[PDB]
Amino acid sequence: ETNEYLSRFVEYMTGERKSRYTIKEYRFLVDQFLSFMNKKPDEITPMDIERYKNFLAVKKRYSKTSQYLAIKAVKLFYKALDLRVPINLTPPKRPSHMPVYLSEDEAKRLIEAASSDTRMYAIVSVLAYTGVRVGELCNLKISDVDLQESIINVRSGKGDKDRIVIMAEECVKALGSYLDLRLSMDTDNDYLFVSNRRVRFDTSTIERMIRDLGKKAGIQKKVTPHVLRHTFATSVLRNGGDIRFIQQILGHASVATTQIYTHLNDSALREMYTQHRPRY
Secondary structure: OHHHHHHHHHHHHHHOOOOHHHHHHHHHHHHHHHHHHOOOHHHOOHHHHHHHHHHHHHHOOOOHHHHHHHHHHHHHHHHHOOOOOOHHHOOOOOOOOOOOOOOHHHHHHHHHOOOOOHHHHHHHHHHHHHOOOOOHHHHOEHHHEEOOOOEEEEOOOOOOOOEEEEOOHHHHHHHHHHHHHHHHOOOOOOEOOEOOOOOEOOHHHHHHHHHHHHHHOOOOOOOOHHHHHHHHHHHHHHOOOOHHHHHHHHOOOOHHHHHHHOOOOHHHHHHHHHHHOOOO
């Protein structure tokens, strides 16, 4: 009966070339689905599905991983029976795209991947710690850096959108080791960061490096300067920095721009909620 449903389920999984191990699991999970529904698969309603999910999550206390595995098993079972997959199994998802940024841990990995390379390391540190734009970094002059005051002066090409940025201790050390080298180079320029041809970088080359460094760090997410900046501005916010201040630092004329880089992820947002929840 239900055996006959399980038996075709296995035959289908056998056909699809799954391991004995996987089949045994999928089978066991679908069996508990039928056992709980206690009705024919074609007869299963959306509310039935919602009862089964609550069964998994509440009564059986499954983790999400386990919840997902069961759900995947049942779907495959529906597919095996040439039956319609209850739409409620898959359902309409947590909001689609809004841009994605790095975890505080991913940042550490991004930076550290670059400690082999004094120049890379100083480059990455400045973007990660100061919030500057590629381009602004390219046109930094050695004289714009003030290590002792932990400040970079950021001036324009152009419109005069001038400001200072502030470096964290670790960024002060990073640049510091780079400037030691930079200072001994016999360059025809005083740009802070210089290419292998000892000239100012091209905005494009920097993005390549940031990109590659992200791979070298084993980061699934594609890493770009915009992402790093989303990362930084978000961290400052998570750390209690007011939006208007973050705006000052990034050099944004309107908060609408600063909003783009402070869009929080679900985890972050839930934390920020707990931390500042309504009190009644």
